[PDB]
């Protein structure tokens, strides 16, 4: 049992060590296009870029670069598009990609201003009377509703392709209490937030990939996707004892760098998967218990 390895690891204080090892055994594919002089301003951090083999391309003959890389999971059968927090100049590309990839859900695991620093652009309207019009990519985004909770908030945006005058409802999940280089207040708060997103049909195969992100799109985003993916496997296999987190993390770092950035984030990913397993393993009554513990009211 993973719960074995976990109590074993914690006991010996091996989280930082193991983490050094995951870092050490981690893939490294080139990021040529990111580093192109021209794309310099299409990137928030000079040290976080998309492997060109997994990068997502804007369907424009102009410049198809967007710091974002499609993670495609085969066994779990799930794809996610982790991307960094759009910059002032790139919120058009962010919605262009969302439209092209056919997503139906966005997951923001960060705050626009954290510990007094700008981490991500206010890429979506906050008031229904003020829509946004992305000139460069010809899109209109508008707030339709907003369901504010304790530590998170869902929104229903309406993305309209000013070109085909086609419209789509983008649900938006926003975690607002996951600190930069931090962990969720609790496995409960996290899994509660996770399941909400699940139920909304956003993670549904019938749509494009969910666009997940934080300020850089590797730390809190890797932690969200890892827990979701492991649980996914545990379900299908129905044999939980076979899911190796380190292996699944490593499999994901093939598609995009730095997934998960702190030993404690790794450790947390174990708690989330273990806790949540309980719900996969019939204990349906656990789902509601999480909502209670999350204090999402």
């Amino acid at each position: 049992e993973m719960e074995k390895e976990f109590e074993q690891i914690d006991k010996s204080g091996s989280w930082a060590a193991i983490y050094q090892d995951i870092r050490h055994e981690a893939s490294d594919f080139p990021c040529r296009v990111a580093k192109l002089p021209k794309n310099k301003n299409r990137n928030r951090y000079r040290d976080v870029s998309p492997f060109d083999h997994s990068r997502i391309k804007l369907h424009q003959e102009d410049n198809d670069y967007i710091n974002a890389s499609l993670i495609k999971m085969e066994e779990a059968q799930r794809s996610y598009i982790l991307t960094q927090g759009p910059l002032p100049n790139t919120c058009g590309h962010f919605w262009e990609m969302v439209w092209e990839q056919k997503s139906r859900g966005v997951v923001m695991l960060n705050r626009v201003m954290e510990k007094g620093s700008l981490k991500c652009a206010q890429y979506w309207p906050q008031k229904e009377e003020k829509e946004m019009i992305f000139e460069d990519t010809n899109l209109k985004l508008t707030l339709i509703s907003e369901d504010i909770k304790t530590y998170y908030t869902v929104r229903q945006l309406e993305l309209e392709n000013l070109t085909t005058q086609e419209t789509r409802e983008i649900l938006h999940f926003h975690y607002t209490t996951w600190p930069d280089f931090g962990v969720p207040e609790s496995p409960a708060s996290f899994l509660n937030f996770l399941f909400k997103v699940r139920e909304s049909g956003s993670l549904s195969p019938e749509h494009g990939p969910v666009v997940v992100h934080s300020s850089a799109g590797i730390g809190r985003s890797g932690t969200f996707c890892l827990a979701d993916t492991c649980l996914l496997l545990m379900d299908k296999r129905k044999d939980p004892s076979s899911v190796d987190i380190k292996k699944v993390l490593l499999e994901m770092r093939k598609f995009r760098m730095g997934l998960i950035q702190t030993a404690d984030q790794l450790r947390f990913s174990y708690l989330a998967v273990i806790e949540g397993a309980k719900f996969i393993m019939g204990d349906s009554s656990v789902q509601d218990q999480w909502k209670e513990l999350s204090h999402e009211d």
Binding site: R44, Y45, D47, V48
Partner: peptide, 4 residues
Amino acid sequence: DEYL
């Protein structure tokens, strides 16, 4: 500019 640098995150890591």
